[PDB]
From a paper:
ATAs transfer an amino group of a chiral amine compound to a ketone compound using the cofactor pyridoxal 5’-phosphate (PLP) with a high turnover rate, stable catalytic activity, broad substrate specificity and excellent stereoselectivity, which is achieved by a proposed large-binding pocket (L pocket) and small-binding pocket (S pocket) in the substrate-binding site8910111213141516. The substrate-binding site is surrounded by the cavity among the two domains, the cofactor PLP, and the loop consisting of the residues 129–145 of the other protomer. The substrate-binding site can be divided into two parts as described initially, the L pocket and the S pocket, which is consistent with the previously proposed mechanism for the substrate specificity of ATAs in which the smaller and larger atomic groups of substrates are recognized by the S and L pockets, respectively.
An improved R-[name], designated as [name]-117-[name] was derived from [name]-117, a homolog of Ab-R-[name], by the substrate walking approach for use in the synthesis of sitagliptin, on an industrial scale, whereas both Ab-R-[name] and [name]-117 could not produce such a large compounds. The molecular engineering of [name]-117-[name] involved 27 mutations that made this [name] conquer the severe reaction problems in the realistic industrial production, such as a high concentration of organic solvent, a high temperature for enhancing the solubility of prositagliptin ketone, and a high concentration of amine donor isopropylamine for prompting the product accumulation. In the final biocatalyst [name]-117-[name], Val69, Phe122, and Ala284 (in the S pocket of Ab-R-[name]) were mutated to Thr, Met, and Gly, respectively. Comparison of the active site pockets of the Ab-R-[name] and [name]-117-[name] shows that the volume of S pocket is enlarged by the three mutations. The loops 129–145 of the G136F mutant and [name]-117-[name] showed significantly different conformation from that of the wild-type, depending on the amino acid residue at the position 136. Gly136 was located near Val152 in the wild-type, whereas Phe136 was distant from Val152 in the G136F mutant and [name]-117-[name], accompanied by the long-range alteration of the loop’s backbone conformation. Simultaneously, Arg138 was moved away from the substrate-binding site by the alteration of the loop, resulting in an enlargement of the cavity to accommodate large substrates.
Numbering used by the authors:
A (entry chain B): 8 to 330
B (entry chain A): 11 to 330
The structure:
């Protein structure tokens, strides 16, 4: 269908920019960068012989732009180059080059509120058993699309009903490491499918030890007696998570990575979720069991509000897109 | 390169030449209804097949103009699709017809054909409305690919048991559903670079034999032929190896196999659509028996290649 790039959010702390996309611009509202070319979404295609597809031999990051400012761009590209190195990928561009191109890509979409995926793959120039690393030709692929909300505005305000998956667990670090962001979502998709079977909105997975892990596209945070905790092991080192723990410490709470049991999840004062794709939101029940009184808690509410302020308040967290 | 002189009496390419006028000669893909050359075989980065690897596939081969075990391959593909709740947008008959025609267009008498079914680009992962899903089929046919060279089919291969990674459990990403999610397989390949071995074998979370990147392992001991039952793709080559083993009068079974049984084996071998059957003559530098290929493996290897040329229901002729 047609492109939807702004909304009236029911929420005083989230406001889209007031502007119009130019219909003569074939990149307006969405675009990719593929092998040196800025192209429209319908032409955003990669080789089926790229190992990024047939062996998912790839890592990526996803950042966002809000009111014409990219949020924590440095952290994101640094995390991306760290993940590349963890899987022995040498990026074909420097971090600076990648920032320059991603920011120009956003600019060409004219999008003031955007999500930008930067992906690095092993390439199509070699195959998986290639010993000679000089034969590997890694690729960079980028997309900039309208901002996407994992949970709608009304659930950011009223909260989401969480489900702990029983039919599947998060892939162990000794197989496919969740700390390296990747497209290998077999377990995460099974979890989604289980939410369909059980009638819930979002799943959280446990790890091999039955400790909280993460969900598809989000980290979970658990608050108890003024201590703010988030899973340290089987979870992506989220940049939203990092922000949430910084805000928590600002509010005077102990904020740490930790192992969290399911009993501690059920017994929490407050539970929330976070991600670049939607910000921060409350989880007000788990498996149909209320967290406290089943409405978003006050700590969660101040975290959410503060996260959105950090998206507009001038600071080193914000990098202006040159439209 | 689409032919070789193999130096092996039981492996022989066809004698022919590709027509250079034909832009699909020697390799091609089938993408969204179109037969295209390799260079134009691209898919949408908004296909969930890419960004969530929401996809399954199979790879069958063609030898001397015949597809080998095509029925088994497409049955496995459709079972794997059903396992991840994928409704293929084509029937098994249709996939076979398109795939055989793809091969015909490449003129390849020896080839590997990948058939992939993805969740598509018309929806995103959280879409609850399954009628919105629009799965895509992508196919490719390229020259036959050898996981191990001809001289090592003859002489045998030096195996390594991966210690820095294990095979993904069935409770996360099921190895019995053929998939592109090779993060662990790639790590194992990298560990073989580090430790100086040719191929890796992975263990499962219980430390029992799993499989390797692109191959099943088979362990032979006191006349009994065994292959890992759990953390392993149900290979079509594996199936053939066990049928061959039975025909030779050996007990042939899937089982749980320990590392001690691997080192203590009479014979070990590997198998794959991408290269047939080959010997593993050492593990972690320790000889399997006398460190040369064993007679059971050699018999199985030869019979496998025989099954690739003797007329039977195992072979489907491509109409070039
Ligand atoms: C599996 C998973 N966990 C967590 C996150 C959130 O991380 P970040 O806050 O850096 O977006 C994502 C984002 O896509 C994800 O895919
Ligand atoms: C992980 C894995 N195991 C086993 C096999 C062997 O399966 P088959 O004999 O059906 O080709 C493959 C083939 O690609 C594979 O990728």
């Amino acid at each position: 269908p047609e492109i939807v790039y702004t909304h009236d959010t029911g929420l005083d702390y989230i406001t889209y920019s007031d502007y119009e996309l130019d219909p003569a611009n074939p990149l307006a509202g969405g675009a990719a960068w593929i092998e040196g070319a800025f192209v429209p979404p319908s032409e955003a295609r990669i080789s089926i012989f790229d190992q990024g597809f047939y062996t998912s031999d790839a890592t990526y990051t996803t950042f966002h732009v809000w009111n014409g400012n990219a949020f924590r761009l440095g952290d994101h590209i640094e995390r991306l180059f760290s993940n590349a190195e963890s899987i022995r990928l040498i990026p074909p561009l420097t971090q600076d080059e990648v920032k320059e191109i991603a920011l120009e890509l956003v600019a060409k979409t004219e999008l003031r509120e955007a999500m930008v995926t930067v992906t690095i793959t092993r390439g199509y120039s070699s195959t998986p058993f290639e010993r000679d690393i000089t034969k590997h030709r890694p690729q960079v692929y980028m997309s900039a699309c309208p901002y996407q909300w994992i949970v709608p505005f009304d659930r950011i305000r009223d909260g989401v009903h969480l489900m702990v998956a029983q039919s599947v667990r998060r892939t162990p670090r000794s197989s496919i490491d969740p700390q390296v962001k990747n497209f290998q979502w077999g377990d995460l998709i099974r979890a989604i499918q289980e939410t369909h079977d059980r009638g819930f909105e979002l799943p959280l997975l446990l790890d091999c030890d039955n400790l909280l892990a993460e969900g598809p596209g989000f980290n979970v945070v658990v608050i108890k007696d003024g201590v703010v905790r988030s899973p340290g092991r089987a979870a992506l080192p989220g940049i939203t998570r990092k922000t949430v723990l910084e805000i928590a410490e600002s509010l005077g709470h102990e904020a740490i990575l930790a192992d969290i049991t399911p009993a501690e999840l059920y017994d929490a004062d407050e539970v929330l979720g976070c991600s670049t794709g939607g910000g921060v939101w409350p989880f007000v029940s788990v498996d149909g069991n209320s967290i406290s009184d089943g409405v978003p808690g006050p700590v969660t509410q101040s975290i959410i509000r503060r996260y959105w302020e950090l998206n507009v308040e001038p600071s080193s967290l914000l990098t202006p897109v040159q439209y």
